[PDB]
Amino acid sequence: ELLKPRTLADLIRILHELFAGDEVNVEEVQAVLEAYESNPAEWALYAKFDQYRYTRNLVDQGNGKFNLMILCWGEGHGSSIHDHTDSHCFLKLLQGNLKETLFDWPDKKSNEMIKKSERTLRENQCAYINDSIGLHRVENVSHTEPAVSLHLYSPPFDTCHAFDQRTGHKNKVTMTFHSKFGIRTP
Template sequence: MQGYSGAAIPAWYTRNLVDAGNGAFNIMILCWGPGHASPIHDHADSHCFMKLLSGSLEEVRYEWPQDVDSKIKKALKNKQSGCQRETCQTDSCQSQSVTVADICDRTEKIGAQCEQDGDQEYSINNMVEIGKTTLKLDDVCYINDALGLHRMQNGHIDEAVSLHLYCPPFNSCQIFDSLSGKPTEVPVTFWSKYGTKVDKKVRAQAPITDSQ
């Protein structure tokens, strides 16, 4: 989406849709000015692949708030427990190479399985930082909800540009208050689509945030 304005770091970076992938994935370019940052956010049970095209960005990863798990993480835990009970006699329990197509297919199946889950109650806790990485030109990174939450920020005087692929695409995600851990679901928005700037009146109807 367009960006997110936090209390400590101003953020007006832009999200620009390049390819919608016939509904299978989204490819987008994010442009970051000095001091621009995303909120702490999840990825709506999607997979995020990122490459830095220009400048430098910092990724900060966080644990999910206490007693809070993403749907995909809970599903993977249940699946692992099932394999252990069956003493791993099935092929699905064995180590094997996984392609991007496999990841996307499994995500869609897990998402469908978890739609029947009830609403999760969230504890109010401080966000716990678990890692920090500086990304430079041509560096790549990957994250999904099973690995935790993160935020991206440009703490440098130079601008930065990053390429993102989300598989499958999603229309909303959760952002988390950095002090309380309280989540808020927000719609994703774009500054431009396919090289055409999105109408300001349309963008103004939704909260500004990030789905990266």
């Protein structure tokens, strides 16, 4: 029984129920993430920005089943084209808008990675991606509005790949957390 999360803490409690087992009902997780109405006061603690690039702020460790984190995108900040290390990835906008560009997995032959499609993710919307679907880049293209998104990855992962748009070549990147549970972790 999926009920509307009343607050971010309620959403977290519901996610611990949805990930109590060993599999993941993607449509139910996405529906509950979409149903949480972003309340800035509830997540201000985690919305720690950096002037030069987007930040990853860990919110909950999901009893080991998933990492829930808040990403803070300054104006013009964006990600590399990347995969998700065989994990489910949910991305819910909490403030602002983000452009998501989708790319297919490259072939071994060096080639320009051409976008398959693009879309604008708006406040409160929840997107989903996994490696079977493809790769993506996420960008705050706004010149005037910072964006904040809530991401859930299951299983959690600390490393993934960035892809060079010009060649399709990939490199392993280790991600780091800017803060954990509201505490800056330099």
